[PDB]
Amino acid sequence: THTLHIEEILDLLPHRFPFLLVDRVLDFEEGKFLRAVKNVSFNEPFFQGHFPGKPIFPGVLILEAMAQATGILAFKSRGKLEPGELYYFAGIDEARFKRPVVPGDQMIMEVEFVKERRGLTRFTGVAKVDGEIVCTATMMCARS
Amino acid sequence: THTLHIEEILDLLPHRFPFLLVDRVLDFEEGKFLRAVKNVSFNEPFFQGHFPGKPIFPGVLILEAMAQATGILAFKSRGKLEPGELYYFAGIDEARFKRPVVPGDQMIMEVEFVKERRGLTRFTGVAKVDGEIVCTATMMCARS
Amino acid sequence: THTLHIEEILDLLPHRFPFLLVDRVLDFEEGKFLRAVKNVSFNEPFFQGHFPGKPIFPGVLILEAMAQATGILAFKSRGKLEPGELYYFAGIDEARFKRPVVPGDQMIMEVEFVKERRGLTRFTGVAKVDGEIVCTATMMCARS
Amino acid sequence: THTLHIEEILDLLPHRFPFLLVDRVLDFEEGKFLRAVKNVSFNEPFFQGHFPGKPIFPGVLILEAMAQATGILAFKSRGKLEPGELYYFAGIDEARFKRPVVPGDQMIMEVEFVKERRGLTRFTGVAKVDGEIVCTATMMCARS
Amino acid sequence: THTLHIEEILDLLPHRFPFLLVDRVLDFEEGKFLRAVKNVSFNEPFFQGHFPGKPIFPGVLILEAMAQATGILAFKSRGKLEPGELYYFAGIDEARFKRPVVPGDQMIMEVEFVKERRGLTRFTGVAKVDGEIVCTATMMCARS
Amino acid sequence: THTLHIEEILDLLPHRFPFLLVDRVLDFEEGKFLRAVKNVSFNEPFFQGHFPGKPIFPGVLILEAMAQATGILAFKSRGKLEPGELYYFAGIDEARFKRPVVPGDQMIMEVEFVKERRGLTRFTGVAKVDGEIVCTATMMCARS
C-alpha cells in the first residue's frame, strides 16, 4: 500500500553507489515496521571479488542493507536527516547467516523497531529469499 | 524444471562483469525457447550515468540481455563455444521499448528460436516486468 | 565548422560515466544532421567483460552512442531538456552490425533527422571506422 | 617476526578486488592469534557512496576485514582451502562500533581463536586506530 | 600541529575518485613545506591492472600524489582555486623511483616550495616509506 | 607496415584495465622506435575524478602510456617478459606538458631507444595530438 521506489529512496538515504543496497520499499508503518527488496544481480561490483568463479552476496552486506532499511523507516517516521547529519551503525547482536544469497535472488527484508535506549535505536531484521530466512540480526543505529 | 544458476551461466557465456546481464535461467527447451531473469538493481554500475537522479535501465541493455539469453539457448542446444569463438550480435529488427525498467524490477525474458538463414540465427524476444511487456525485438546472432 | 567538445556535450546530454558515449561533435546542421566521434579505447569499463581476452565494442553500445548523437542534434535544434525531462529511446528498426569495432577505432557517427510521427522522432544513423560502415540503424526517440 | 605481504595474502584468501580488505599481516601464531593491517584510503570505491561529502569506512567492512583476517589464520594454521571450498561467515555476536574510521587511518586488527563448536569456529576481533579501539566483535566462520 | 583530514582536503583540491591521492595532511607551513600521507591499499582500482598477481603502486601516481600535495600547499598559502580554474601539472625534472611501493605502505610525502619562475611554481618532493626514500622529483605547477 | 592491435598488445604487456594505456601500435623498428596510439575517451574511469565538470587527461598518464609503448618496443626487440618479471619505471627526465589532452583526442606517441646504461634503458618520447606536440619526456626503464 505504502511503496517507495528508488527516487524516493535516494531522497531519504544519503548512501549512493556502490553502497546503496535498498532497491524498493514494499510497505511500511511508521514507527513499527518496514519491508524492503534488495535485488541481487551478478552485475554488482562486489561479485568480481566475492568470489571469482563463485558469486556469493556478502553476509556483511545483508546487515548493511537491513540497516539501510531501518534508516528509511527512521526517516519517514521521525524526520529526515538534516544536511551533514548521518545515520550511524552503532552495533549488531546475534547476526546469523543461514545460507548463501546468490545472483537472481530477490532478498526481501523486514525490519521492526524495538525501542530507543541511550541515544541508540534498536531494530530487528529478518531477510528472506523464496520465503525462507537467510539472515537475522538485531541492529543498533544512532543519528549524530 | 530446467533451471540454470549463475555458475552454469558463467560456464556457457563468455561475458563477464560489467556486461553479463542474465542472472538466472528459469526454464528452457533446446531448440525452442528459453526463459531467463535479469534482476535490475540500483547497485549496477551503469545507473551512475543513466541517469544521475533518475535511474533508468538502458533499453539497449534489454536487447543485450535478451541476446545473451539466445546465446545460452544456442549453446545448450547446439554446443558450447570453442575457445576463441564468439557469439556475435549481427542485427536487430523491430525493437520496441514500451516503458522504463527501473531498480527493483525483475525483468523476465523469453526468447524463441525462429529459424536459421544465411549463416545467421533468428530469434524473437519479449521482456516482461510484473507480467507486462516492456520490450520486444527480433534478434539475429552468428558464431564465428 | 560547428564542433562541440566534451564540456558542451556534458551541458546538452544528461548521460554521465559510464554511459556517455559521444566524445566530440565534428559538425551539425540543426534539424538535419550531426556527425559525432566515439573514441574506442581499451581503458573503458565494459571491455573487461566483453570479452576477456578479446575486446569487442558491444554493438548495442553503437546503437546507444548514435541515439546520444540524435539527442545532441534534437537539443541544439529544438531546445534543451528541461530539469527532470528525459530523452527516451523508443524503438529501433533495421540495426545491422557489419564488423567488430575494437580498441584503437575512432567510430565516426552520422545521424540524420527523418521525420516526426506520433510524438516520436525518427532518425537514421550510420557509424564508420576508417571510412567503412560498421553499423546502420533507424532509431525512434521521444522526450517525456 | 611472521609477516605476510599482499602476494602471500592473495595466495591464502580467495577474495579479490573490491572485497579483499587485508593489506598486510604483521604477526601471527598458528592456532592462537593474528594481527593484520587494513590501510583506509580515500581512493577505495565504496567511499564514493558512503558518503558523498563525508567519507566514513563502513562498519560492516570492519567486520569483513576481521573475518578475512580469521581466514588467513585458519588457513595458515589448519590448511589452505581446497579449490571450490569456501570460508563462510556464519554469524556475529556483539559487534560494537566505537567511532568512525576515516581516510588516512591505518586500522590494526587483532583476531584470536576461541574454540571450535558445532562445525563452526569462533573468533574474537578487536580493531584499533592510533591505539584506540574502534570496533570489537565475536565472529563464527565455517568451511564448506 | 596543522593537520588536514579528508573533508578539508576535498574542499581544497578539485580531484575526486579515482584520482584523489592525498589522504591526510600531517603538517604544513604556508609558503614553505607540506607533509602529507597517501595510504596504499590493495582495494584501490588501479591495482587490478598494475599488475595482476603482483600489486605495484604506479610510480606515475607517486608523482601525482606529490603534485596534489603541492596544490594543497599552494591553496592554503596563496588562495583557493576559483570556480573553473585549475591546477595544472606543467613539468617534471629528475623523477627517480628507488623501489616499489606496495599495498600496506603508508607513503609519507614532503613537498617544499622552491620558487616561482615564469608563471610556473617549482616544488621539490620526496616520498618515504618506513623512513626510507622511495621517490624524489622536482615538479612545476601553474594555475590557469 | 608493422602494426599491433590490442590482442597482440595484451600478449606483450602485463598491464590490464584500468592501467593499460596503449590501444594500438602503428609502426615500429626493433631497437629503434615505436609509434603507438592512445585514444582518449570520456568513458575512461579517471575522468570522473580529473576533473568533475572539466575532463583533462592526466599528464602523469601520458608518461605512463609512453613508458608502456617503450615496453612494447623492448619486448618485441629484446624478448618477452618471463612470468613474474616486471618492466619497471626507474626514472624520468625533462617531462614537459604543453597543453591539455581531452576526450576525443587521439594521442600519437613516438618512442625512441637512446641507449642502455647502468642496467637501465633510456628512451625519449613525444606525444602529439592533431600533429602538435603535447608532451615530451625522457624515460628510464629496467627489467627485474
From Swiss-Prot, chains A, B, C, D, E, F:
UniProt-annotated catalytic positions: 50
Chief location bin: cytoplasm
Keyword field: Cytoplasm, Lipid A biosynthesis, Lipid biosynthesis, Lipid metabolism, Lyase
Leading EC class: lyase
Catalytic activity: a (3R)-hydroxyacyl-[ACP] = a (2E)-enoyl-[ACP] + H2O
GO cellular component: cytoplasm; membrane
EC code(s) of this entry: 4.2.1.59
Keyword Oxidoreductase in record: no
One GO-annotated biological process of the protein: lipid A biosynthetic process
Molecular functions per Gene Ontology: (3R)-hydroxyacyl-[acyl-carrier-protein] dehydratase activity
Protein location: Cytoplasm
Main function: Involved in unsaturated fatty acids biosynthesis. Catalyzes the dehydration of short chain beta-hydroxyacyl-ACPs and long chain saturated and unsaturated beta-hydroxyacyl-ACPs.
Family label: Belongs to the thioester dehydratase family. FabZ subfamily.
Protein name per Swiss-Prot or TrEMBL: 3-hydroxyacyl-[acyl-carrier-protein] dehydratase FabZ
High-level lineage: Bacteria, Pseudomonadati, Pseudomonadota, Gammaproteobacteria, Enterobacterales
Residues of the full protein shown: 5 to 148 of 181
